[PDB]
Amino acid sequence: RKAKLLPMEEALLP
Amino acid sequence: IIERLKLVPLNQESVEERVAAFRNFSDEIRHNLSEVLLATMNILFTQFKRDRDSQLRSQARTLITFAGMIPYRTSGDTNARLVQMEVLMN
Amino acid sequence: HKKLVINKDMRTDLFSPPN
Amino acid sequence: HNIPDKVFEHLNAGEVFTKLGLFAEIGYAWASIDSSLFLWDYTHPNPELIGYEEATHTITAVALVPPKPGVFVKTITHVLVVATTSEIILLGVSATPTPSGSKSLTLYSTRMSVHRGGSDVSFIVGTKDGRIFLGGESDTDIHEIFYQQEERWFSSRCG
Amino acid sequence: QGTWIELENGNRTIEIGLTTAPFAAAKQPLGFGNELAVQFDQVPGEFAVLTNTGVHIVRRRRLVDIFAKALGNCVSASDDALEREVRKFINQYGRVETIAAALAVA
Amino acid sequence: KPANDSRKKAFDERKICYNLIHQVLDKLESDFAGEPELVDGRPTLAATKRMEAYNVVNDSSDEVFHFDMYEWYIEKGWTDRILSIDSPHVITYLQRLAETDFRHAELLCRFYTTRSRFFEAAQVQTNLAKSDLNISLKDRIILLSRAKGNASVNTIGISRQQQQQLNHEASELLEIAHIQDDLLERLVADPRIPEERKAEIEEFLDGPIRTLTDLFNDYADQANYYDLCLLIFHAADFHNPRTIMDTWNNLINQSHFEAEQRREYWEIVQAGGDLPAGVIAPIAEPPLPYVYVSQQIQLIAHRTSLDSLIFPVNSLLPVVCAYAINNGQDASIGADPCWPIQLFLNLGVPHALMVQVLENVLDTQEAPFTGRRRKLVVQWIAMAVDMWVREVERRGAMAAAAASGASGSEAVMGSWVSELLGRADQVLTQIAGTGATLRGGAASDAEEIASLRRTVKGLKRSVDMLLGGEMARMSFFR
Amino acid sequence: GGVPGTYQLVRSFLNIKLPAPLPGLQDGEVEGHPVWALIYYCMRCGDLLAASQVVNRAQHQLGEFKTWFQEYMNSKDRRLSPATENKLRLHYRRALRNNTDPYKRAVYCIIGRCDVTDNQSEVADKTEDYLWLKLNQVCFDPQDRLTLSQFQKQLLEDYGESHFTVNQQPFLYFQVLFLTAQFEAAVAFLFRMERLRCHAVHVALVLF
Incomplete structure (x- = not known):
């Protein structure tokens, strides 16, 4: 299963 | 199943009452007492080869004393086989 | 283990030689 | 611990190239x-295998390094550096511990990447402060990857 | 103190990494390497040995681990069998460290 | 045997004697290899020396000796004689050495089983399978499989509850173990996996059984083995419809591309061309993509038994139907346009649930099921209801013979099925109309649709008759 | 040419040893041979499967014998259940004690281990056919019953060497003693033949 890559928006602040 | 019927005693305390009951049970039942004791013994016999050991040993004894006090069909061959199967347990 | 834990954050690149 | 059969x-x-490595800090292999x-x-x-197959060219090095402070959300515990024959790719990582005692790993995209160039990348190391240094089997040169949160008209997010 | 750990035929070692927190008994060189002092403050170091067939976990053994294991072999022996094993520890670690290990195991 | 102790010497001086005893018995069977145990009836001289020797052995009261002999019998492989001792002494000796070696544990378990102590054997085998001893995955699979069997049968003196709990732990661990074994095998054989990595995979998977999380994340998902991912979601009671369907979608697409590729290679062989370097030709027409896809669905279905959460028919049937349309897996290539429906019916999906879903597909007009392609949706419904009718008719005949009156669970037909066929006729009337006024010229499917109408009417008739009382009078003679 | 199947061999064996049809046979034929002859010589060769195939092609003719035979082939130690064993024996004893089909007689009391006194001499004319006929009739724990101890003792005590060595063929008696577990008798006996001393000493060593 290809790993779900959550978005940049959550990753980097602010 | 055989335990429910309370036909063959398995604890020494029940021997007195079970022995008295045999006297007034239909001869169609007393006839098959020989095969019942052996099957029940062979049942305990098999379960032994698989505390619990004391419990089976105690029940083994019970069947013998019952059969000893009961005059029934083929009591000769049956009472002997019952005693042998109890010796192998120990 | 019969309990699954997905963790795409820090894996090991299956398509590369090792460091 | 045996390698999973699927691996x-x-x-x-x-077809051409394979490689194994360790992320002993978090109990993961790759x-x-x-x-x-x-x-x-x-x-x-x-x-279960965490698969990542976005890369277009052969992977030559992989490493797990600390993040640059004040860049990512606090829940991002590491950065995954993936070097290929064409580019280096940064992925956000969150290795949060689980009830069983083994980190739960989830990956985040970053839009942070740079073209490799002519020098092979076979070695990646990270500093406590998140600095990323690169080297390989083409020469003795040492490169560094920079990255920042903000996009600028005169400077990219990753250099 | 050294030892040889054998890997089976076909095991090619690839990488070895620390799985526990970095060791440190002090914050400066003097005192830094005192394994004895931290026997009960941080778990023994463990190391993941990656091969082409799997990951092997290697664990550092402390004095108390050695002392307990050695005594476990003296359970079935004489009064003089313990004294002999204990004298090995005294000759290496000194009497205080050895008796402190016995207290800890106890 | 505490090292540093000074009884070792005493033990060594006995071991030198015991070894020499091994040589004697060894040379005995050697000297008399081929010699008969009986001649003309009575025993030979070679036989009597065998008995006289082995007598001295069984006549001993040296205990360290008998321990050394049990170990020796095990070594030489003589399960013949050791399992035939009888004595508990050997059982008690094994009970200490069991949690230590696989070979010894197997002997212990063999003793228990012949004594109808199946539960105790299942306990030893299970613990061994969970242990950190050096045991291969396949051996752990055998251990669990045996424990499962032994815990599923009565053992006297032990409660049903205690048996079931063990039988259940063995069943779960065995399911996970088989998954792990499928992975390992596939990964090692995979041409697209670098050798360097394979050795690493073999190290972490050919040992103690791993958690389902690891198997998924570190292996099954990385290698895109979606079928095994699905089996893992099943074994984990994974409640997540969206991920499950995403995995179904990836499995279908992956399989389609692979079938397409194989048919291409074949077409090149039958045309004279050369295949890519290192491509084993196909000496025979491989299956069309929809055939290989449905093969994948069957293999999984049989492995999980349809009662799983990885077979939400309300989501999975529309997706497969979607695939059929969007990839021309229909009449154009010689396939049965109803193949998706056939697939799930044979698989054992209840007829009522099928029609129920198909209704939802028709009402919502989603994804590709729109415009005049609803012609196809109507055809599937016609085929499903037709099979349902046939089923009801046979179950009626069935219950007239073997007599009685019953019918639980199975959904039973309502007026809703009749209404559904009415709407289906309307959809067809609408599609035909739209088709007659298309830009460029009328549609070519005029009679095709006229036929479907007749079929649908026929079915509404039948269904109307059943609903109207012919279903309560099925066990009656006409 | 290839060893043919035990069925086709037996069929190609009946052709020779009975060229013309015996008028006393029963239950018709099967592919040109009496059904009971095929069953006997198939059991004699030891291929019960080949014999059961013969039964399957004569289901209508053989009556209830099918369910009985199918049990014999299943049950180990070549013995039937006491209940079913009783059903067939009484039937045979009822009106088939003297049937004009000797092969029918043989099969029935080979399956039921009955009529131990009747040596079925019509079909078991050789010595090995007798041994085999009886070892299929011995029993283990009162009337119409024979045990190995009785049979082994009955043979040499009543019919000693004299009976089995009149044809001046020594091995015939040896096989009788050896195939009945009387190894010491056979060894001493064969050890007296001055031409077979070597062989009797060694068969003693093997047993030793």
Whole structure:
């Protein structure tokens, strides 16, 4: 299963 | 199943009452007492080869004393086989 | 283990030689 | 802890290049097969494979480094650096511990990447402060990857 | 103190990494390497040995681990069998460290 | 045997004697290899020396000796004689050495089983399978499989609850173990996996059984083995419809591309061309993509038994139907346009649930099921209801023979099925109309649709008759 | 040419040893041979499967014998259940004690281990056919019953060497003693033949 890559928006602040 | 019927005693305390009951049970039942004791013994016999050991040993004894006090069909061959199967347990 | 834990954050690149 | 059978299937399905490595800090191992990467928790008795196959060219190095402070959300515990023959790719990582005692690993995209150039990348190391240094088997040069949160008209997010 | 750990035929070692927190008994060189002092403050170091067939976990053994294991072999022996094993520890670690290990195991 | 102790010397001086005893017995069977145990009836001289020797052995009261002999019998492989001792002494000796070696544990378990102590054997085998001893995955699979069997049968003196709990732990661990074994095998054999990695995979998977999380993340998902991912979601009671369907979608697409590729290679062989370097030709027409896809669905279905959460028919049937349309897996290539429906019916999906879903597909007009392609949706419904009718008719005949009156669970037909066929006729009337006024010229499917109408009417008739009382009078003679 | 199947061999064996049809046979034929002859010589060769195939092609003719035979082939130690064993024996004893089909007689009391006194001399004319006929009739724990101890003792005590060595063929008696577990008798006996001393000493060593 290809790993779900959550978005940049959550990753980097602010 | 055989335990429910309370036909063959398995604890020494029940021997007195079970022995008295045999006297007034239909001869169609007393006839098959020989095969019942052996099957029940062979049942305990098999379960032994698989505390619990004391419990089976105690029940083994019970069947013998019952059969000893009961005059029934083929009591000769049956009472002997019952005693042998109890010796192998120990 | 019969309990699954997905963790795409820090894996090991299956398509590369090792460091 | 044996390598999962699915990794053996991929490894023996390798056309040109394969590689194994360790993320001992978080109890994870990884295997790269050509342009594909697979991570898994080796402490788990029947692990699931975290697959990452976005890469277009052969992977030549992989490493898990600390993040640059004040860049990512606090829940991002590490940065995953994936070097290929064409580019280096940064992925956000969150290795949060689980009730069983083995980190739960989830990956985040970053839009942070740079073209490799002419020098092979076979070694990646990270500093306490998140600095990323690169080297390889082409020469003795040492490169560094910079990255920042803000996009600028005169400067990219990753250099 | 050294030892040889054998890997089976076909095991090619690839990488070895620390799985526990970095060791440190002090914050400066003097005192830094005192394994004895931290026997009960931080778990023994463990190391993941990655091969082409799997990951092997290697664990550092402390004095108390050695002392307990050695005594476990003296359970079935004489009064003089313990004294002999204990004298090995005294000759290496000194009497205080050895008796402190016995207290800890106890 | 505490090292540093000074009884070792005493033990060594006995071991030198015991070894020499091994040589004697060894040379005995050697000297008399081929010699008969009986000649003309009575025993030979070679036989009597065998008995006289082995007598001295069984006549001993040296205990360290008998321990050394049990170990020796095990070594030489003589399960013949050791399992035939009888004595508990050997059982008690094994009970200490069991949690230590696989070979010894197997002997212990063999003793228990012949004594109808199946539960105790299942306990030893299970613990061994969970242990950190050096045991291969396949051996752990055998241990669990045996424990499962032994815990599923009665053992006297032990409660049903205690048996079931063990039988259940063995069943779960065995399921996970088989998954792990499928992975390992596939990964090692995979041409697209670098050798360097395979050795690493073999190290972490050919040992103690791993958690389902690891198997998924570190292996099954990395290598895109979606079928095994699905089996893992099943074994984990994974409640997540969206991920499950995403995995189904990836499995279908992956399989389609692979079938397409194989048919291409074949077409090149039958045309004279050369295949890519290192491509084993196909000496025979491989299956069309929809045939290989449905093969994948069957293999999984049989492995999980349809009662799983990885077979939400309300989501999975529309997706497969979607695939059929969007990839021309229909009459154009010689396939049965109803193949998706056939697939799930044979698989054992109840007829009522099928029609129920198909209704939802027709009402919502989603994804590709729109415009005049609803012609196809109507055809599937016609085929499903037709099979349902046939089923009801046979179950009626069935219950007239073997007599009685019953019918639980099975959904039973309502007026809703009749209404559904009415709407289906309307949809067809609408599609035909739209088709007659298309830009460029009328549609070519005029009679095709006229036929479907007749079929649908026929079915509404039948269904109307059943609903109207012919279903309560099925066990009656006409 | 290839060893043919035990069925086709037996069929190609009946052709020779009975060229013309015996008028006393029963239950018709099967592919040109009496059904009971095929069953006997198939059991004699030891291929019960080949014999059961013969039964399957004569289901209508053989009556209830099918369910009985199918049990014999299943049950180990070549013995039937006491209940079913009783059903067939009484039937045979009822009106088939003297049937004009000797092969029918033989099969029935080979399956039921009955009529131990009747040596079925019509079909078992050789010595090995007798041994085999009886070892299929011995029993283990009162009337119409024979045990190995009785049979082994009955043979040499009543019919000693004299009976089995009149044809001046020594091995015939040896096989009788050896195939009945009387190894010491056979060894001493064969050890007296001055031409077979070597062989009797060694068969003693093997047993030793």
